[PDB]
Amino acid sequence: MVPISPIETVPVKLKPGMDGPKVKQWPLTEEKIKALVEICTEMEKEGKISKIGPENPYNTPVFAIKKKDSTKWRKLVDFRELNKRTQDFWEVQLGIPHPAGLKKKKSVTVLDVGDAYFSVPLDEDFRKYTAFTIPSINNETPGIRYQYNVLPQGWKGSPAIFQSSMTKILEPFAAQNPDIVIYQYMDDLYVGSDLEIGQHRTKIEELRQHLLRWGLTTPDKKHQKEPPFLWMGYELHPDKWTVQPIVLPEKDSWTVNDIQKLVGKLNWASQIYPGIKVRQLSKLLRGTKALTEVIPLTEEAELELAENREILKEPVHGVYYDPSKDLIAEIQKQGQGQWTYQIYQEPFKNLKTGKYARMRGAHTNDVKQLTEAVQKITTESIVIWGKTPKFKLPIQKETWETWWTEYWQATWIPEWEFVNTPPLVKLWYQLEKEPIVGAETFYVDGAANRETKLGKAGYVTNKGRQKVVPLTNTTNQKTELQAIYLALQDSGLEVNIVTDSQYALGIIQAQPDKSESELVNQIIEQLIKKEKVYLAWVPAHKGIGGNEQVDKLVSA
Amino acid sequence: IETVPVKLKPGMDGPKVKQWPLTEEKIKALVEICTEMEKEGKISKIGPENPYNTPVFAIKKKDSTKWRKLVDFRELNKRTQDFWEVQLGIPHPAGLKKKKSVTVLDVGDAYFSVPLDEDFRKYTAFTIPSINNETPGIRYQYNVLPQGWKGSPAIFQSSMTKILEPFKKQNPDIVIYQYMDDLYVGSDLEIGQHRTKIEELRQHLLRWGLTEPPFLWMGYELHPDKWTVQPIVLPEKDSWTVNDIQKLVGKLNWASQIYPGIKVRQLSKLLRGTKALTEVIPLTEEAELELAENREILKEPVHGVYYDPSKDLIAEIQKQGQGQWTYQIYQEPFKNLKTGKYARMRGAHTNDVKQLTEAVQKITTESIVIWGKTPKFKLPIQKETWETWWTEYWQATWIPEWEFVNTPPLVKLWYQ
Ligand SMILES: C[N+]1(C)CCc2cc3c(cc2[C@H]1[C@@H]1OC(=O)c2c1ccc1c2OCO1)OCO3
Ligand SMILES: Cc1cc(/C=C/C#N)cc(C)c1Nc1ccnc(Nc2ccc(C#N)cc2)n1
């Protein structure tokens, strides 16, 4: 006998105040019991489970399930109740590597470590909670009682404890062989390197020898799995990656479900297929959730879908990451709050692509959305590559400078350069810092009656120009905006406007270029036509003229 | 040498805070730092039966070339029991903010000399992430009092008081105040004399240590006796345009929420007509008198202003442009406890976000000196922008709480 090192147990507890499970065993057919008896006798021989005395008060139900197209049974232990009662664990598997962050490899070898899993012993003090009972034939004897000695399949702690145990075992091997990479997934180890094949094979044999120290054996007869790999919805190849085939179905009509699935595929595709769009399709799913409802596609959705089909007509692949090179991220505006990007190191060779959509909200502008996209890409890039890419953005340096220096919030985007690819992001208007000499001054006001919803909006000017318009089904806020709109409409290319609307100032000072409010959009359209606009605020009801006059005209 | 039992607050579990993404340089730095700390017995690797987490990152303190590990214990700090067993609390010294010079020392390394309650260690779990999650994050917990945890100064306090006694006894006029990993040391000595005393003080810690700290040597000098405040001031002009008067009436209307007897009636009558904004308007006698009366009111302190230690401090900041920032600290609206203005943002000429991050740190320091706690910030920045960048510019060993302001305040104009 060659001594093997035991695997250290992870200590496990139930949640505070909770006892173990006490769940009734279901009746089983005579045929199933005989099957289960055989399996457990075999499992017992192998040391996975042990017969226990009558003292243990816990129980978890066991089932026998027929393996389709076979006459063979499998055991299934239903640990749902124990799982609810078991502590939370650190789950190492939460974050999966993005293929775009991987490095090219010459060789990747797969080793089956399926035998090691049932070799991971269970914390001695916890075993009692895993007790289960094989019912007896005709219920004429006590059921056969067992508990687990190893990590049970289906138990809450098994994946985290298995993974952590394998990592600790593999640690010294990885540390002392810095020229390979090792990745565990389920019951397999993946071992990659750039060594000449003879040296790579030697490393695999050395890994096998290392693993034997804990008695974990692997099959001489090599894995059926070899590059390329199907993994987590991707295809991994030695020197490129892609998403698994994306096939958009033909349909005469689309249900809610069809559309959710369609958008899901497009979202998945968008990490390597450049320019994917989902706005108009996603708009169809707004608010409603009877999955069977049939939604007529809008013309816009039909256009988006056709554009996506064209994007998807043939395979596109990404390359892997070369740490010796800079990362570059380029962004384009697509319209309707949509943005698309590519991250590459060499021209025409993307590591990945992606998209960003405008946030929900009342008003917005392209510079703010571009800024948001940059932060999103920055954070994604730190995760995947550990560094911020250099940005190529469709905004002139002078535009950005004017924006950030004058914007009421602090704002920043990291190192970037202008790329002249339309449509360019620009500032559509900029308010004056000081009142304009020689420009007509419009004193504006609006008010509405909260009961009748009638209101008025208008202005008076230093030239004696005046206007009041009667409005129906309106509110104070809308009349305040209407008054500013009237002043913009009726003035020359330069204008001073005096308002008491805190609401309107708060909107305009946010510098929107688009709004959910049609009225705000009309104001923006007017601002775009002006050469100079100075917007002055004064407090209401303070005897402040022009304002006071217009208030009287509009509050009547 | 013996641990103080510590617990979380009733009905609370440990922190489970996500680790945010770290750059390659910071991961490599933390791996190097934690390997040494593990070797020194300060931290130990942990297994999957510990599900807790607190985020970690790395910074460079002001004027140093070495990376410092910084744990963001904000969540654990909220969840941790309060510490009143031995003492009700150290009355904050009101004399500290009156000293001519205050030097801030990093004394956090001293805490590592005290073991942490074995049953509490699990709640200090943290993770060093790997790039692209390619390898499992390296998981550790503390065996000793951690830097940045509110329990550390609380537990170490009896040890600190004993270490400093001869210095206090030899220098009875020095004010020493501990906040988290910081020691604040104030005197009225000529700086040269002051610095030598600071170095004298370091020698006690070093001496104690050896019976080696990476950052004790440093010294952040403050001069709170010179700290400057911001009363409300009105323009002095010979010629007022309609616009000037509108701005003045606006500012006064706002100030009238702070000061009761402020009046705008007579000034407001000036804005009655509908004159071009740039037209000059002569002040009436009634208006001049009202302006004069308002100026006199604004020279007095605000009525009914008091500090309540049971209430949060709130700090608001406005970007004024050209590297300038204004701020106010209050507990009740219109009852400012401190206001101020900065323009001296060091090495941040084309970066607003770095400037704001440095403003937040300066304001928090002022807050610690004056009241002995940190304010809750209202930051004029989008969440996503702040959260992407602030850790790049952070140099302090504590972290305050903050929320984001998404609608432009009109008030910015009045602090300008
Ligand atoms: C907490 N300890 C006792 C120390 C260090 C450590 C660090 C870990 C871990 C478990 C452990 C355990 C313990 O130490 C081991 O090396 C170990 C441990 C428990 C279980 C194991 C182990 O190797 C094989 O299976 O999971 C992943 O990271
Ligand atoms: C995450 C991961 C998944 C699989 C495999 C999962 C599955 N199924 C295999 C390995 C070895 C890794 N780990 C790493 C780490 C760094 N670079 C790489 N590059 C890399 C991986 C596979 C191929 C290929 N073909 C090429 C390069 N892989």
Short mmCIF file of C-alpha atoms in Angstrom, two decimals, chain B:
data_model
loop_
_atom_site.label_atom_id
_atom_site.label_comp_id
_atom_site.label_asym_id
_atom_site.label_seq_id
_atom_site.Cartn_x
_atom_site.Cartn_y
_atom_site.Cartn_z
CA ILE B 1 -2.72 39.44 24.28
CA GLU B 2 -6.18 38.44 25.48
CA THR B 3 -9.05 39.14 23.13
CA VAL B 4 -12.02 41.38 23.89
CA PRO B 5 -15.19 39.43 23.04
CA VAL B 6 -16.97 41.19 20.16
CA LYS B 7 -20.35 40.71 18.59
CA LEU B 8 -22.49 42.02 15.74
CA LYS B 9 -25.75 43.77 16.59
CA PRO B 10 -28.81 41.58 17.46
CA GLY B 11 -30.45 39.79 14.51
CA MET B 12 -27.73 40.72 12.07
CA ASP B 13 -25.49 38.39 10.11
CA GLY B 14 -22.04 39.24 8.80
CA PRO B 15 -21.35 41.42 5.76
CA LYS B 16 -21.73 39.92 2.30
CA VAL B 17 -20.47 42.77 0.13
CA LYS B 18 -19.39 42.20 -3.43
CA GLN B 19 -15.70 42.75 -4.30
CA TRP B 20 -15.56 45.41 -6.98
CA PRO B 21 -13.21 45.06 -9.99
CA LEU B 22 -9.53 45.79 -9.38
CA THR B 23 -6.84 46.69 -11.89
CA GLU B 24 -3.88 44.36 -12.42
CA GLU B 25 -1.47 46.70 -10.56
CA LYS B 26 -3.71 46.76 -7.49
CA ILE B 27 -4.22 42.97 -7.47
CA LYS B 28 -0.46 42.37 -7.70
CA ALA B 29 0.07 44.88 -4.88
CA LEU B 30 -2.50 43.21 -2.63
CA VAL B 31 -1.09 39.74 -3.35
CA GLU B 32 2.35 40.95 -2.27
CA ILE B 33 0.99 42.70 0.83
CA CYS B 34 -1.23 39.80 1.92
CA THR B 35 1.52 37.22 1.46
CA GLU B 36 3.63 39.18 3.93
CA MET B 37 0.72 39.73 6.32
CA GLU B 38 -0.03 35.99 6.29
CA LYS B 39 3.62 35.25 7.01
CA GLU B 40 3.44 37.69 9.93
CA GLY B 41 0.33 35.92 11.25
CA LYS B 42 -1.95 38.95 10.79
CA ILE B 43 -4.27 37.20 8.37
CA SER B 44 -5.02 33.54 7.54
CA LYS B 45 -6.51 31.81 4.49
CA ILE B 46 -10.15 30.69 4.81
CA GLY B 47 -12.37 27.97 3.44
CA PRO B 48 -15.79 27.88 1.78
CA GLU B 49 -17.64 27.50 5.09
CA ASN B 50 -17.13 31.27 5.47
CA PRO B 51 -19.63 33.07 3.20
CA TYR B 52 -18.90 36.63 4.35
CA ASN B 53 -17.10 39.36 2.43
CA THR B 54 -15.92 42.97 2.67
CA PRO B 55 -14.31 44.74 -0.31
CA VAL B 56 -10.59 45.49 -0.39
CA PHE B 57 -8.49 47.75 -2.60
CA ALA B 58 -5.16 49.51 -2.52
CA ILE B 59 -4.19 53.18 -2.37
CA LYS B 60 -1.09 55.32 -2.16
CA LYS B 61 -1.11 57.70 0.82
CA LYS B 62 -0.11 61.31 0.17
CA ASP B 63 3.65 61.55 -0.62
CA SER B 64 4.50 57.82 -0.46
CA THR B 65 5.58 55.34 -3.15
CA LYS B 66 4.40 52.19 -1.35
CA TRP B 67 0.90 50.70 -1.88
CA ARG B 68 -1.33 50.44 1.19
CA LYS B 69 -4.11 47.88 1.58
CA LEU B 70 -7.46 49.53 2.34
CA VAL B 71 -10.42 47.51 3.49
CA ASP B 72 -13.84 49.08 3.03
CA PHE B 73 -15.39 48.02 6.35
CA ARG B 74 -18.41 50.32 6.05
CA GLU B 75 -20.90 47.45 6.15
CA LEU B 76 -19.16 45.56 8.99
CA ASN B 77 -18.86 48.80 10.92
CA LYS B 78 -22.64 49.33 10.76
CA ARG B 79 -23.28 45.73 11.79
CA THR B 80 -20.79 45.69 14.66
CA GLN B 81 -21.94 46.20 18.27
CA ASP B 82 -21.33 49.54 19.88
CA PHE B 83 -18.42 49.71 22.33
CA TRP B 84 -19.37 51.16 25.70
CA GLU B 85 -18.23 48.37 28.08
CA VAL B 86 -15.22 50.11 29.67
CA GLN B 87 -16.04 53.73 28.76
CA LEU B 88 -19.22 55.61 27.83
CA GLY B 89 -17.18 57.25 25.03
CA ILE B 90 -14.29 59.68 24.75
CA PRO B 91 -15.80 63.20 24.92
CA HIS B 92 -14.52 64.68 21.67
CA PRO B 93 -12.00 67.37 22.43
CA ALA B 94 -13.41 70.72 21.47
CA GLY B 95 -9.95 72.18 21.88
CA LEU B 96 -8.54 70.27 18.94
CA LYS B 97 -10.13 72.53 16.29
CA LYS B 98 -8.67 75.53 18.08
CA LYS B 99 -5.04 74.43 17.79
CA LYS B 100 -2.67 76.24 15.46
CA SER B 101 -1.35 73.04 13.95
CA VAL B 102 -2.77 69.55 13.87
CA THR B 103 -0.71 66.73 12.44
CA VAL B 104 -2.39 63.48 11.40
CA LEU B 105 -0.52 60.24 11.92
CA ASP B 106 -1.28 56.78 10.60
CA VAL B 107 -1.09 54.61 13.74
CA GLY B 108 -3.11 51.71 12.28
CA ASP B 109 -0.11 49.38 12.32
CA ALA B 110 -0.25 49.32 16.15
CA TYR B 111 -3.59 47.49 16.02
CA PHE B 112 -1.94 44.41 14.50
CA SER B 113 -0.31 43.74 17.87
CA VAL B 114 -3.69 42.78 19.34
CA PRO B 115 -5.37 39.46 18.58
CA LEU B 116 -8.96 39.54 17.37
CA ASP B 117 -11.64 37.51 19.10
CA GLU B 118 -11.55 34.06 17.50
CA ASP B 119 -15.33 33.92 17.15
CA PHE B 120 -15.42 37.30 15.39
CA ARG B 121 -12.63 36.80 12.80
CA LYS B 122 -14.88 35.20 10.19
CA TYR B 123 -16.78 38.48 9.76
CA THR B 124 -13.55 40.14 8.51
CA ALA B 125 -13.34 37.91 5.42
CA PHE B 126 -12.12 39.49 2.21
CA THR B 127 -11.09 38.38 -1.25
CA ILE B 128 -8.26 39.24 -3.56
CA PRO B 129 -9.89 38.80 -6.97
CA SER B 130 -8.12 37.51 -10.10
CA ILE B 131 -8.25 39.16 -13.53
CA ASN B 132 -11.13 37.68 -15.54
CA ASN B 133 -11.92 35.34 -12.63
CA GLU B 134 -9.48 32.90 -14.15
CA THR B 135 -8.31 31.59 -10.76
CA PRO B 136 -10.37 31.40 -7.54
CA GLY B 137 -10.12 34.67 -5.55
CA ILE B 138 -7.70 34.36 -2.62
CA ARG B 139 -9.75 34.37 0.59
CA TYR B 140 -8.46 35.61 3.97
CA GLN B 141 -9.71 36.71 7.36
CA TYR B 142 -7.97 38.79 10.09
CA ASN B 143 -6.41 37.24 13.22
CA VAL B 144 -5.63 40.66 14.71
CA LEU B 145 -7.43 44.04 14.91
CA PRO B 146 -7.85 45.22 11.26
CA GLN B 147 -7.19 48.72 10.00
CA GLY B 148 -10.44 50.52 9.17
CA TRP B 149 -12.70 48.56 11.54
CA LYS B 150 -14.43 50.68 14.18
CA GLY B 151 -13.74 48.07 16.85
CA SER B 152 -9.98 48.40 16.51
CA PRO B 153 -9.46 51.83 18.12
CA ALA B 154 -12.14 50.89 20.63
CA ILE B 155 -10.35 47.70 21.69
CA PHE B 156 -6.87 49.16 21.45
CA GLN B 157 -7.82 52.25 23.42
CA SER B 158 -6.58 51.09 26.81
CA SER B 159 -3.28 50.08 25.18
CA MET B 160 -2.99 53.43 23.37
CA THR B 161 -3.75 55.41 26.57
CA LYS B 162 -0.93 53.60 28.35
CA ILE B 163 1.55 54.08 25.51
CA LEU B 164 0.93 57.84 25.27
CA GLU B 165 0.84 58.70 28.98
CA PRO B 166 4.48 59.80 29.44
CA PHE B 167 4.23 61.97 26.33
CA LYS B 168 1.00 63.52 27.59
CA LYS B 169 2.53 63.92 31.06
CA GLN B 170 5.65 65.55 29.60
CA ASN B 171 3.55 67.65 27.22
CA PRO B 172 0.25 68.44 29.04
CA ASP B 173 -0.85 71.11 26.56
CA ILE B 174 -0.85 68.83 23.55
CA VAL B 175 -4.23 67.62 22.34
CA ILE B 176 -4.29 64.08 21.04
CA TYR B 177 -7.38 62.63 19.44
CA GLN B 178 -7.78 59.18 17.93
CA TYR B 179 -10.17 58.54 15.05
CA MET B 180 -10.05 55.09 13.39
CA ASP B 181 -6.48 54.52 12.10
CA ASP B 182 -5.63 58.20 12.54
CA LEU B 183 -4.02 60.02 15.45
CA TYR B 184 -4.64 63.81 15.50
CA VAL B 185 -1.97 65.78 17.37
CA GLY B 186 -2.46 69.50 18.00
CA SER B 187 -0.16 72.14 19.52
CA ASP B 188 0.48 75.89 19.44
CA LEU B 189 4.22 75.53 18.93
CA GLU B 190 6.30 76.98 16.12
CA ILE B 191 6.15 74.31 13.37
CA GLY B 192 9.82 73.36 13.71
CA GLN B 193 9.20 72.77 17.42
CA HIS B 194 5.87 71.15 16.50
CA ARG B 195 7.43 68.66 14.06
CA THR B 196 10.14 67.62 16.50
CA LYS B 197 7.40 66.86 19.03
CA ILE B 198 5.56 64.84 16.42
CA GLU B 199 8.77 62.90 15.80
CA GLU B 200 9.25 62.58 19.56
CA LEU B 201 5.78 61.01 19.59
CA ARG B 202 6.67 58.57 16.78
CA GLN B 203 9.59 57.36 18.79
CA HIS B 204 7.25 56.21 21.57
CA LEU B 205 5.25 54.09 19.13
CA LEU B 206 8.38 52.68 17.50
CA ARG B 207 9.86 51.98 20.94
CA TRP B 208 6.61 50.30 21.93
CA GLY B 209 6.49 48.37 18.64
CA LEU B 210 9.88 46.79 19.24
CA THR B 211 8.92 45.40 22.67
CA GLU B 212 7.88 47.61 11.40
CA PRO B 213 5.15 50.14 10.48
CA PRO B 214 5.17 51.16 6.78
CA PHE B 215 3.44 54.54 7.26
CA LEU B 216 4.04 55.94 10.80
CA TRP B 217 6.78 58.21 9.48
CA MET B 218 4.39 60.30 7.38
CA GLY B 219 2.74 63.50 8.61
CA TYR B 220 -0.30 65.38 7.29
CA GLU B 221 -0.21 68.93 8.69
CA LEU B 222 -3.44 70.89 9.18
CA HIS B 223 -3.96 74.39 10.53
CA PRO B 224 -7.53 74.57 11.75
CA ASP B 225 -6.99 77.92 13.49
CA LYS B 226 -6.65 79.20 9.93
CA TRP B 227 -9.66 77.32 8.56
CA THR B 228 -11.91 79.76 6.74
CA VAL B 229 -15.67 80.08 6.70
CA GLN B 230 -18.15 81.68 4.34
CA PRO B 231 -20.66 84.33 5.55
CA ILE B 232 -23.28 85.63 3.07
CA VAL B 233 -22.00 88.72 1.23
CA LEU B 234 -23.88 91.01 -1.19
CA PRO B 235 -22.28 92.97 -4.05
CA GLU B 236 -21.17 96.60 -3.55
CA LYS B 237 -21.89 98.40 -6.82
CA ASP B 238 -22.22 101.95 -8.10
CA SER B 239 -24.43 100.89 -11.09
CA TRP B 240 -27.07 98.12 -10.80
CA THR B 241 -28.59 96.65 -14.03
CA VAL B 242 -32.03 94.98 -13.94
CA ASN B 243 -30.15 91.68 -14.04
CA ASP B 244 -27.94 92.63 -11.09
CA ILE B 245 -31.00 93.50 -9.05
CA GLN B 246 -32.76 90.25 -10.03
CA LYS B 247 -29.70 88.29 -8.83
CA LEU B 248 -29.62 90.30 -5.62
CA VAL B 249 -33.33 89.74 -4.92
CA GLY B 250 -32.92 86.04 -5.66
CA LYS B 251 -29.96 85.75 -3.29
CA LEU B 252 -31.79 87.71 -0.59
CA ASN B 253 -34.95 85.60 -0.95
CA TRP B 254 -32.79 82.53 -0.35
CA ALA B 255 -30.94 84.18 2.54
CA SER B 256 -34.30 85.05 4.14
CA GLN B 257 -34.82 81.33 4.84
CA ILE B 258 -31.67 81.48 6.94
CA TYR B 259 -32.11 84.93 8.38
CA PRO B 260 -35.65 85.95 9.41
CA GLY B 261 -35.62 89.68 9.13
CA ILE B 262 -34.23 89.83 5.57
CA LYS B 263 -36.59 91.96 3.41
CA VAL B 264 -36.86 92.31 -0.39
CA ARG B 265 -40.02 94.36 -0.74
CA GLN B 266 -38.37 97.70 -1.66
CA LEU B 267 -35.74 96.13 -3.97
CA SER B 268 -38.35 94.01 -5.63
CA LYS B 269 -40.30 97.12 -6.53
CA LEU B 270 -37.34 97.99 -8.79
CA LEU B 271 -37.97 94.99 -10.92
CA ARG B 272 -41.54 96.10 -11.57
CA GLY B 273 -41.16 97.46 -15.04
CA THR B 274 -40.16 95.53 -18.05
CA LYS B 275 -36.83 96.93 -18.81
CA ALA B 276 -34.02 95.42 -20.83
CA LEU B 277 -31.93 93.13 -18.59
CA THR B 278 -28.75 95.11 -19.15
CA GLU B 279 -30.43 98.48 -18.44
CA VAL B 280 -29.08 100.35 -15.41
CA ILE B 281 -31.68 101.03 -12.72
CA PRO B 282 -31.10 103.70 -10.09
CA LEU B 283 -31.77 102.53 -6.52
CA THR B 284 -34.58 104.32 -4.70
CA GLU B 285 -33.90 105.60 -1.19
CA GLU B 286 -36.21 102.94 0.18
CA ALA B 287 -34.25 100.27 -1.69
CA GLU B 288 -30.84 101.48 -0.48
CA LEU B 289 -32.05 101.47 3.10
CA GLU B 290 -33.42 97.96 2.70
CA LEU B 291 -30.11 96.79 1.18
CA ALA B 292 -28.16 98.41 4.03
CA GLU B 293 -30.44 96.82 6.61
CA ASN B 294 -29.97 93.43 4.95
CA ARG B 295 -26.18 93.78 4.93
CA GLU B 296 -26.19 94.40 8.68
CA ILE B 297 -28.33 91.32 9.33
CA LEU B 298 -25.89 89.14 7.34
CA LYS B 299 -22.97 90.13 9.59
CA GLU B 300 -24.54 88.23 12.48
CA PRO B 301 -24.42 84.51 13.22
CA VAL B 302 -27.44 82.40 12.28
CA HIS B 303 -30.06 81.97 15.05
CA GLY B 304 -30.79 78.64 16.72
CA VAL B 305 -27.71 76.77 15.44
CA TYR B 306 -26.50 73.88 17.62
CA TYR B 307 -24.68 70.53 17.24
CA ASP B 308 -26.49 67.35 18.36
CA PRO B 309 -24.18 64.30 18.58
CA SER B 310 -27.21 62.01 18.20
CA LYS B 311 -27.81 63.32 14.66
CA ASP B 312 -26.07 62.73 11.32
CA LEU B 313 -23.93 65.42 9.84
CA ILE B 314 -24.78 66.19 6.21
CA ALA B 315 -22.34 67.68 3.70
CA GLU B 316 -23.33 69.24 0.40
CA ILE B 317 -20.79 70.23 -2.27
CA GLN B 318 -21.20 72.51 -5.35
CA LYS B 319 -18.92 72.65 -8.34
CA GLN B 320 -18.26 76.34 -9.04
CA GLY B 321 -15.88 75.87 -11.98
CA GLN B 322 -12.22 76.72 -12.50
CA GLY B 323 -11.21 74.23 -9.86
CA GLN B 324 -13.36 75.84 -7.19
CA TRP B 325 -15.74 73.99 -4.85
CA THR B 326 -18.09 75.24 -2.12
CA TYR B 327 -19.51 73.08 0.69
CA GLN B 328 -21.80 73.24 3.73
CA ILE B 329 -22.09 70.89 6.70
CA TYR B 330 -25.38 70.91 8.63
CA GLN B 331 -27.79 68.69 10.55
CA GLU B 332 -30.92 70.79 9.97
CA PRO B 333 -31.66 72.66 6.75
CA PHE B 334 -30.57 76.33 6.83
CA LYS B 335 -28.65 75.74 10.07
CA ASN B 336 -25.11 75.36 8.75
CA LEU B 337 -22.52 74.27 11.25
CA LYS B 338 -19.64 75.01 8.87
CA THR B 339 -19.37 76.30 5.31
CA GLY B 340 -16.24 76.56 3.19
CA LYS B 341 -14.69 76.89 -0.26
CA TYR B 342 -11.71 75.17 -1.93
CA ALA B 343 -9.62 76.06 -4.99
CA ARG B 344 -6.32 74.28 -4.31
CA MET B 345 -6.85 70.95 -5.96
CA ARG B 346 -3.41 69.50 -6.23
CA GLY B 347 -2.57 67.73 -9.47
CA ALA B 348 -6.17 67.56 -10.70
CA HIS B 349 -6.35 70.32 -13.33
CA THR B 350 -8.31 68.47 -16.04
CA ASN B 351 -10.09 66.02 -13.74
CA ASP B 352 -13.28 67.07 -11.93
CA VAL B 353 -13.74 63.72 -10.36
CA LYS B 354 -10.32 63.72 -8.77
CA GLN B 355 -10.99 67.25 -7.49
CA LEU B 356 -14.29 66.20 -5.98
CA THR B 357 -12.71 63.11 -4.41
CA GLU B 358 -10.07 65.29 -2.81
CA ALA B 359 -12.75 67.77 -1.64
CA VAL B 360 -14.65 64.90 0.02
CA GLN B 361 -11.52 63.84 1.88
CA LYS B 362 -10.71 67.37 3.06
CA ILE B 363 -14.28 67.91 4.29
CA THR B 364 -14.31 64.58 6.10
CA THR B 365 -11.01 65.51 7.86
CA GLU B 366 -12.48 68.85 8.94
CA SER B 367 -15.52 66.95 10.23
CA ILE B 368 -13.39 64.54 12.28
CA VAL B 369 -11.42 67.41 13.81
CA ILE B 370 -14.54 69.41 14.73
CA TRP B 371 -17.08 66.75 15.80
CA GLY B 372 -15.20 63.45 15.73
CA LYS B 373 -17.29 61.78 13.04
CA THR B 374 -17.86 61.75 9.27
CA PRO B 375 -20.76 63.45 7.45
CA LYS B 376 -23.06 61.89 4.88
CA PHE B 377 -22.23 63.49 1.51
CA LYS B 378 -24.56 64.70 -1.20
CA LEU B 379 -22.30 64.52 -4.21
CA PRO B 380 -22.94 66.45 -7.47
CA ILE B 381 -21.99 63.52 -9.72
CA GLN B 382 -23.72 60.58 -11.39
CA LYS B 383 -23.43 57.37 -9.35
CA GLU B 384 -21.84 55.40 -12.17
CA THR B 385 -19.12 58.03 -12.74
CA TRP B 386 -18.32 58.33 -9.00
CA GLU B 387 -18.33 54.59 -8.45
CA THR B 388 -16.04 53.92 -11.39
CA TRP B 389 -13.37 56.38 -10.29
CA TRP B 390 -13.23 57.51 -6.63
CA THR B 391 -11.04 54.63 -5.48
CA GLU B 392 -8.35 55.86 -7.93
CA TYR B 393 -7.88 59.07 -5.97
CA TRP B 394 -8.63 57.98 -2.42
CA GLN B 395 -5.79 58.52 0.04
CA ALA B 396 -7.55 58.33 3.40
CA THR B 397 -7.85 55.21 5.56
CA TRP B 398 -11.56 55.74 6.42
CA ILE B 399 -14.51 56.09 3.96
CA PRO B 400 -17.63 58.23 4.59
CA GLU B 401 -21.19 57.53 3.30
CA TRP B 402 -22.55 59.38 0.26
CA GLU B 403 -25.60 59.76 -1.96
CA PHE B 404 -25.91 61.38 -5.38
CA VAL B 405 -27.60 64.61 -6.49
CA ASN B 406 -29.13 64.27 -9.97
CA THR B 407 -31.08 67.60 -10.21
CA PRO B 408 -29.05 70.87 -10.41
CA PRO B 409 -29.56 72.91 -7.24
CA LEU B 410 -30.47 76.52 -7.89
CA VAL B 411 -28.52 77.35 -4.66
CA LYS B 412 -25.12 77.02 -6.38
CA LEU B 413 -25.46 80.62 -7.48
CA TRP B 414 -25.82 81.83 -3.93
CA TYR B 415 -22.64 80.23 -2.64
CA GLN B 416 -20.71 81.39 -5.73
#
